[PDB]
Nucleic acid binder design. Structure first.
Lengths: 203, 133, 260
RNA sequence: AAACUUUCAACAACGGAUCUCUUGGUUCUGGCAUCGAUGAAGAACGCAGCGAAAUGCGAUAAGUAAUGUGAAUUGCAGAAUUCCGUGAAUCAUCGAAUCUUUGAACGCACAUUGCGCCCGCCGGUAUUCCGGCGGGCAUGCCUGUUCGAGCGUCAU
RNA sequence: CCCACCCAUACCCCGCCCUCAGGGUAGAAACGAUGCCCUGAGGAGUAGGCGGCCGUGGAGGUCAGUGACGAAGCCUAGGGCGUGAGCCCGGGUCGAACGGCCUCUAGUGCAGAUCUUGGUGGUAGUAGCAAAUACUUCAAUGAGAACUUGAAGGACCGAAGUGGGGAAAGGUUCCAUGUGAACAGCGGUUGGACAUGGGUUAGUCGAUCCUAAGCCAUAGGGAAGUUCCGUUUCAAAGGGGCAC
RNA sequence: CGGGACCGAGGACCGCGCUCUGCAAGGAUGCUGGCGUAAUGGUCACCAGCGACCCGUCUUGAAACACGGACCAAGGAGUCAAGGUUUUGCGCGAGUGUUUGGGUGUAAAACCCGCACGCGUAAUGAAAGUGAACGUAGGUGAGAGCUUCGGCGCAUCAUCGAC
RNA sequence: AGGUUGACCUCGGAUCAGGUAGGAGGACCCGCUGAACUUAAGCAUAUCAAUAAGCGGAGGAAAAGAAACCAACAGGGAUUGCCCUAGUAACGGCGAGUGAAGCGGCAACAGCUCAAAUUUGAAAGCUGGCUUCGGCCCGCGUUGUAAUUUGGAGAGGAUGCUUUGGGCGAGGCUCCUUCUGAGUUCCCUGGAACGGGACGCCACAGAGGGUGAGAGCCCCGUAUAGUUGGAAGCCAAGCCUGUGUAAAGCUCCUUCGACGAGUCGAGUAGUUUGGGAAUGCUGCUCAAAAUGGGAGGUAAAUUUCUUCUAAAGCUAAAUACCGGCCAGAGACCGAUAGCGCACAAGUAGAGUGAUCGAAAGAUGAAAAGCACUUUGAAAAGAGGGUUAAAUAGCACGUGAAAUUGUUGAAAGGGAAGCGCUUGUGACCAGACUUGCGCCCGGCGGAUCAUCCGGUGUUCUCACCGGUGCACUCCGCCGGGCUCAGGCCAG
C-alpha cells in the first residue's frame, strides 16, 4: 500500500529546521513575555468537558468563559479581556456543575489579581493599593490555573457496610432491559394507541 | 574560540576578504610593531605603516638592515625600504618587497593625525587596563 | 542539484553504422555540439542515483539505552586500567575517580585560565593536558579545505555542579586545549566515550560527586540495570572449592604426546 | 655484418594523467521586505593621458557634492603633500546632485536620428525672413471646475 | 598364443596447504582459550547460495606516529612478504603534507557497453596537390625570388569580356607606410593577412513626400484572457465667415 | 644374502617392546673434504625440448554463424526513500515508544519532561450484539532435565475433552 | 419680455485643477484554463492529474477566518499549521488503484464593521479652492453624509453607584562609531623559521587568515565586560495638572426587538469529489418563506428534537518559500568533479528565427623574466648569468601512459605473444665475518658473604647507609680447551 504513483518528489518536506524553529519560537516567547511583563503571557481559560462518549470522561481547557459565568462572577464583559480573561460568547452552560466550577475559577483569579491604576498619582477604588502591589507573581496561567483533576479518581475506599445493594435483577439484565425498551418504545406506543381506539369504539 | 554569530571562521571567506580588501582596509592590514623604546614612550604596540617611517628588518635574508620606508605598495601588500635593493641583470637597481610584519618601526613619521592615532590608542589601552584591573 | 546534467538539449542520432546511441547535443559552432549527454558515463552528465536531502541522517535511539550507555561509560571511567588503555596519562593521578574540593573551583576561584591550569597541574592532570598540547597535527585530506584543519587528543573532562559551583569555571577551563567541562546533570556519551572507546579521564568536584545519586534517582522510567553476572572474577569462581571439589579428574594435559 | 622489424634499459621527446592546492560550486540553517509614469527591468550608444574586454560611470561620464579615514596611485607618463592639513587614495560610507538615445514609453511616427503643433527667451539688417535654446502636447478612469447639448421632466 | 617393456592429475607411500570432524587444556607455574596441543577423513565445478579477507574518498578515537636533515605523487633489467587481491623496502625524481590500528561512513574497485571526453599510432612521406591554352630574358630589392617590381618578349579574355559602373549582401576589405610568426593546401621580399595612421564634403544625386498590393490605431462588438474583428462603422469624430 | 633409487616429518622424558652393560624399540645421526663467495640461490633477456586457438557477448542441447574490440589515460552502471516480511544483536517487558511539542543548553549536539496517541494486552459476527477456568488451567502417550529412585515432568508433538 | 426668463435630469468638451493604472518580478500565494507520455495485457470509465504547459491578480507572506460549524456528548466553540485520526469510513472496468472528516495533544491566539430605525428642536457629515491659519467660499449630499444599533444583542423604561482629558518624565532597549593580552630571547637545519631544542609570557582571547615552510604571544582579527561620539524610534517606574457641559459601564423590566432575493431551494446538463444512494462549482428552466430558513452523509410522507442564522464586509500570530538582499555553516565536490560558467561565461561560436551554447585554473618567496660576449637575415643557439632549484625560461609546480628519437644489449628461413624445465650472458638479495662456557696468567676497582640501622614490600623478600682488605666479587687484556656456528658435497 505505497502511494508513490504521483510526482511525489516535488512535494517532499524535510524537517532540518526543527531545532531552528524551536529556537525561533523560544525567542518570540521571550520577547512576548518581556513586552507583557508584569502580566502573564497567556489568558485565563475555563474548564470544559470534551464531547463524544470516548472523551467525556476527561476535562480540559476551553476557549473562553461564558457571559453568564462572567455575570455570576461579577466581571463585566468589557473589562474581562483587558485583565487577562478569555471570553467565549458561543459556549453555553447547560448544567449547573460546569457553571459553578468556572465561576469559582473566576473568583479565585479575581482574588489573586493585582490591578495597577491607569494613572499612578490618581488611584481609583477598584484599583489595587500600592502597599498590596508587591507580592510574588506567576507569569503562566496555563500552569498556575491548569486542569488539576482531568479525570475522576480511579480508586476509592468505603466501608463494607456501605456497599450498595445493587439494582434488582443484576446489571447485565438491566442493560438488556434498557436496550429492549429503547428498541420497543414505538411498537408499544402504537399498540397502546390501537387498544385505546378499540376501547373507545367498543366501550 | 569565536562566540559571536557575526564572526566567521571560514578559510575561504577569510582569504577572499584578505585578497580583495580595499585600500583603506589594506592600510590596517599592513601594520608593523613599534620598537621597545617607542612602545615604552607611547604605550602603543602596533600601528599602520606609512611612507617616511624608519624601520629595522627582523626577518628574512635582509635582517638587521635599516632604512626609511620609501613606498607602500598596498596593491602588492609590500613596502620598499631605501638601500634594501637588488641588482637586475642590466646592472640597474630594483627595490625588494618586504612584508610590514617582518619589520619593526624605530622612528615614526609624525604629524597631527599620527599623534591623534597614538593618543587614542594609548587612552584606550589605559582605559581597558583600568577597567579590567 | 536536481537539475545537474539535465540543462541540455540533446537527442540520440539513432541506430547506424558509425557512433554509439547516446544522446548528443544538438546545434553547431561549438565543441559541445555532437557530444554525449545525460548519461552517468558521460562527461558533463548526470550522476547515477543523485543524492537527495531526504536521506536518513538522524538516528532515533531509545532513551533507556542512552541512559544504559551513559551509566556504563561512567562506570568505565572509574577503572584505572581502562583510562590507560584509552590513552590517558594518569600515572601521577593520586586517585581514580579524582575528586577535587568544590572550594577550589566554586565562584571565581578558577575563573582565570592560569588559575585553572595551575589547579590541573596540582591535582595531576598536567601530563594529560601536556599530551593534548603536544599532540596537535595537521589533518590528512580534504577536511583541511572543509574547515577541519587540525587534530589533537582528548584531555580531562571536568564535571561540576552548576547550582553549587557556578559556571565561571567553564570560562576558566575553556581556552586550555583538550580540557572539556560538563554539568553533572547533563552528562554526554560523546564526551564519556570519545570515538566509542570507554575510559575517559574525569575530574569531579565534590558537589558533583554528591549530586550524582540524586541525578540518577530523578530519571523517570529508568533504573540502574542489573547485571547478568554477579561475580566477574572468573578465576575466583573456577578455582573456588565449591566447583573444584565436584569435578572429574583431568583426562589429559595441555600438551599431548604423539602416539605413533 | 649492417639496415629493417620486434623486445629489454637509460636519457630525451609527445601528451597532460597523478599528487598537493582552491577569492568557485552544492546543500542546509538564521535574519530581512525594499522595483516602476518622481519613468523600472531590459536594450543601445558613449565616457580614462595612454583600454578592446571585464568592472565603474552618463556630456558634471573609471565620475561631482557630503561624511569619515588619514598618505597614496602604480603598467608607463605626468603631477603630488605646506606632512602639523577645507587633505592623497582605482579608499570607505553615502542622506545632496548629475543621469545621453531608448524601453510599460507618452505629439504623430520609426526598416526615417522623418514630420508636426502650442507658449516663451535669445541672436542675426528685420512688423513679415533665418537660426538657436527652454517648457509642453499619449490612453483609460476618479473627484472637482468650467463651457455646453437634448420638449427628457418641469416652473414662469 | 607367449615374454618383457613405455606412461595419466588414476592407484600406493611420504611431505606441505586448506576445510570438515572428534578429543585435551584452571583450587590457573596462567591464555592474541577468538589461543595452543593430539588424531582421522576429504579436496573439479556453470547457474545459484554462504564466509573471510584486500584496496579507495571522508568521520570519531588512538599511535606523546612520519615529515623541508624532504610528506604526497611518479619511474625502476633492484629486493622481501602473501596461494591471491595486495603489502613493505632500496635507488632515482620531486616539493608540503601524509600514514598505521579499532570503530563510523560512501558518488568505493573496469577490458569490453558501434561506451563518454581527451590524447596518440600503423596506413604514410602514401593518396594526392592534372578543368579554365603559357610562359621566357635582363636588371633591381632581399638572408632567400617560377608565382615581388621595372623594362624586354610571347600569349589570352575578344564588347552576352577576364572591360567600365551599379542594386541586394558585406562593412573598412579602400589609400599610404611598415611587418617576425600564423594564413595565402608549393614558395613569398608579395597580400583582401598582420601593425600604425589617413580617407566618404550636396537646396539640384537618392532617402525624406505620394499612394499601390497590403498592414496597424481609433468608434464599436467579441473573448476567462493573452487578445480577435473592425478602417467608415449604429461616433456629438469641424471648418469658414460676420457682428456698435 | 646382495645391488640401486627417493625421502629424514617430529623435537626433554613418558609408550609398546627386544637379541636387556645395551638396542635397528612412539620419524637421522656420526665422520670427513673443498669453499666462505656471486660458489649455492634469485631476477631479466635469449636460444633449446615438450606443451599451448582470441577475448568478451549471444544462441540453443551444443557448436557454427553473428555482434563488439587500432592504442592509452581519466570517467563509467543494483542506489536512496517509504512500506512489509524473515533472521541477527541490544534495552525494557504486560507493557513499550523522550525528540508533534515543552524545558534546558558550552546552541542544528547533549541532557530533561509529560498529556494525549500508536502498537500490544480479546475475540467473533454483514450487523444489532455478545464475549473466553468443571477440574492443583483437564485426560492419555511421548519427552530433555531433576529425583527422596516411589516419581515430578520443561519446550514441543500426537490424541480426547472443556471455555 | 412669456416665441421670455429660469429650475432640474441625462449626456458631452477641455494640453481644464488635482490624482491614479499599465511594465518588471512571479520561489512561495489567489483564481481561470488544461493535456499526453505513464499505469491498467491492449483499451473509449479509470490512472497519471483536478498535475505540466497557457492566462489573469497580490504580498512579505498570501489565503482563510470570528459558524446558516462540529456534534448527539456530562457536549465542544473563528481561522491556520504539526502529530494523530488513517491507508480508516468511503469510491472503483475486466481492478489497476484512489482516499477524507469530527473528536484528541500541541504551536499560536483577537476581535469586530455595515444594510435594514426619523437628528427631525434644526446634515450634527465630507472632497476641493482661498487664507491674515481665525475662518471664508465653490460644491457633494435628503434618491441620506454624521451620531446610535448588529443578534454575544439591542431600543425604550426604572434605579443608584461607578468611569474618562492633557503634559512632563528618571531609567531601559534597538543601530552605527573610538579602544583592548602576551617572545620576533638564545642555539641548530634552511634561500626564508612559521621546523627542532632551551628558557619565558598571555589566555572570558589555543576561532579564522596573512607573513619567504606547521605562529596563542610578528600583523589583522578572536573573548569579555565595558568605554568614546551621534541619530531616530519604542517601552517605561513615577510626577504635575482639568473635571463632568458631555459621553461610558453595571443591575432589573411590562413592552418593542427591523436582521441581506433571480437569492435560497428544485429539476436538468457538464465537470468535480472518498462523498458513481450522502460532495462542491457553473450554465439553462422554475423560483420561495416568516419561528421562517439551512444542516443533521439512504429516497419519501407524518410527528418531534438538536444545532446554527446564508445570500454584505474587515482583521495580527502560529503556516509556505528552487525569486531577491544580508549572514552563518557541512562526515558535500576538488578543475572530465562541483552550477553550463573557479578564468573579459550565458562569453566566444552556431542558427533566418525560436533557440542552442563550449573550451579554458597552478613560474617563482621575490621577476630576481637572463646583463655582457659570440654565431646567425631572423627565430633562436652557445658561452656567461639570476635562483635554493631553469632537473621552475611567461611552451612555465609535479610531469604517468599510448606513441617517438638517440644510445646500449639481443632475436629474426611465411606471425608473435604464453606454460613447464635446463643452459648462456647480464645483474642482484641474503648468509658469513664469530659467540657462549670453562682453565690459567696479568691488570683495574671494591655495588663479594655475614651482621647492624632505616625504608619499601608480595610480610619474606628486597633496596639504601656502615662492614669486606682481597683464596671473595665485577669488568678488561693475553693464551689454551670444549661446544655451537655459513654454502656445496663424499
Amino acid at each position: 500500500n505505497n502511494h508513490f504513483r504521483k510526482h511525489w518528489q516535488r512535494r517532499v518536506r524535510c524537517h532540518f529546521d526543527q531545532p531552528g524553529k524551536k529556537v525561533t519560537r523560544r525567542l518570540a516567547r521571550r520577547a512576548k513575555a518581556a513586552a507583557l511583563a508584569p502580566r502573564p503571557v497567556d489568558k485565563l481559560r475555563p474548564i470544559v468537558r470534551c464531547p463524544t462518549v470516548k472523551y467525556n470522561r476527561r476535562t480540559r481547557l476551553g476557549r473562553g468563559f461564558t457571559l453568564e459565568e462572567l455575570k455570576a462572577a461579577g466581571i463585566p464583559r468589557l473589562l474581562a479581556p483587558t485583565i487577562g480573561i478569555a471570553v467565549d460568547h458561543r459556549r453555553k452552560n447547560l448544567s449547573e456543575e460546569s457553571l459553578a466550577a468556572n465561576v469559582q475559577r473566576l473568583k479565585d483569579y479575581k482574588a489573586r489579581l493585582i490591578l495597577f491604576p491607569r494613572k499612578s498619582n490618581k488611584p481609583k477604588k477598584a484599583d489595587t493599593p500600592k502597599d498590596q502591589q508587591t507580592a510574588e507573581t506567576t507569569t503562566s496561567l496555563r500552569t498556575s490555573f491548569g486542569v488539576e483533576q482531568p479525570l475522576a479518581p480511579g480508586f476509592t475506599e468505603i466501608s463494607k457496610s456501605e456497599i450498595p445493594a445493587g439494582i434488582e435483577g443484576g446489571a447485565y439484565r438491566a442493560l438488556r432491559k434498557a436496550r429492549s425498551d429503547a428498541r420497543l418504545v414505538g411498537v408499544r406506543e402504537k399498540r397502546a394507541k390501537e387498544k385505546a381506539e378499540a376501547e373507545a369504539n367498543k366501550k | 574560540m569565536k562566540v559571536r554569530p557575526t564572526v566567521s571562521s571560514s578559510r575561504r571567506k577569510a582569504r577572499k576578504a584578505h585578497f580583495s580588501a580595499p585600500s583603506s582596509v589594506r592600510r590596517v592590514i599592513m601594520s608593523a610593531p613599534l620598537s621597545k623604546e617607542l612602545r615604552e614612550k607611547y604605550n602603543v604596540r602596533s600601528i599602520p605603516i606609512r611612507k617616511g617611517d624608519e624601520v629595522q628588518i627582523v626577518r628574512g635574508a635582509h635582517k638587521d638592515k635599516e632604512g626609511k620606508v620609501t613606498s607602500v605598495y598596498r596593491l602588492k601588500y609590500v613596502i620598499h625600504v631605501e638601500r634594501v635593493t637588488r641588482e637586475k641583470a642590466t646592472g640597474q637597481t630594483v627595490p625588494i618587497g618586504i612584508h610590514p610584519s617582518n619589520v619593526v618601526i624605530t622612528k615614526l613619521h609624525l604629524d597631527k593625525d599620527r599623534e591623534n592615532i597614538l593618543a587614542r590608542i594609548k587612552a584606550g589601552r589605559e582605559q581597558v587596563a583600568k577597567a579590567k584591573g | 542539484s536536481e537539475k545537474a546534467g539535465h540543462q541540455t538539449s540533446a537527442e540520440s542520432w539513432g541506430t547506424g553504422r558509425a557512433v554509439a546511441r547516446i544522446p548528443r547535443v544538438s546545434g553547431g559552432g561549438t565543441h559541445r555540439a555532437g557530444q554525449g549527454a545525460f548519461g552517468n558515463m558521460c562527461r558533463s552528465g548526470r550522476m547515477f542515483a543523485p543524492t537527495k536531502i531526504w536521506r536518513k541522517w538522524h538516528v532515533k535511539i531509545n532513551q533507556g539505552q542512552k541512559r544504559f550507555a551513559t551509566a556504563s561509560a561512567l562506570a568505565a571511567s572509574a577503572v584505572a586500567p581502562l583510562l590507560m588503555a584509552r590513552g590517558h596519562q594518569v600515572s601521577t593521578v593520586p586517585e581514580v575517580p579524582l575528586v577535587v574540593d568544590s572550594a577550589a573551583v566554586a565562584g571565581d576561584a578558577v575563573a582565570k585560565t592560569a588559575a585553572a591550569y595551575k589547579l590541573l597541574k596540582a591535582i595531576g592532570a598536567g601530563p594529560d593536558v601536556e599530551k593534548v598540547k603536544k599532540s596537535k597535527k595537521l589533518r590528512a585530506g580534504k577536511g583541511k579545505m572543509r574547515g577541519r584543519r587540525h587534530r589533537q587528543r582528548r584531555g580531562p573532562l571536568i564535571v561540576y555542579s552548576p547550582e553549587h559551583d557556578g559556571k565561571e569555571l567553564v570560562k576558566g577551563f575553556r581556552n586550555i586545549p583538550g580540557v572539556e567541562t560538563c554539568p553533572v546533570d547533563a552528562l554526554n556519551l560523546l564526551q564519556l566515550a570519545p570515538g566509542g572507546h570507554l575510559g575517559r579521564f574525569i575530574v569531579w568536584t565534590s558537589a558533583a560527586i554528591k549530586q550524582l545519586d540524586a541525578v540518577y534517582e530523578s530519571k523517570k522510567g529508568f533504573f540502574l540495570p542489573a547485571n547478568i553476572v554477579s561475580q566477574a572474577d572468573l578465576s575466583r569462581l573456577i578455582n573456588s572449592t565449591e566447583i573444584q571439589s565436584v569435578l572429574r579428574a583431568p583426562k589429559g594435559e595441555a600438551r599431548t604426546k604423539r602416539a605413533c
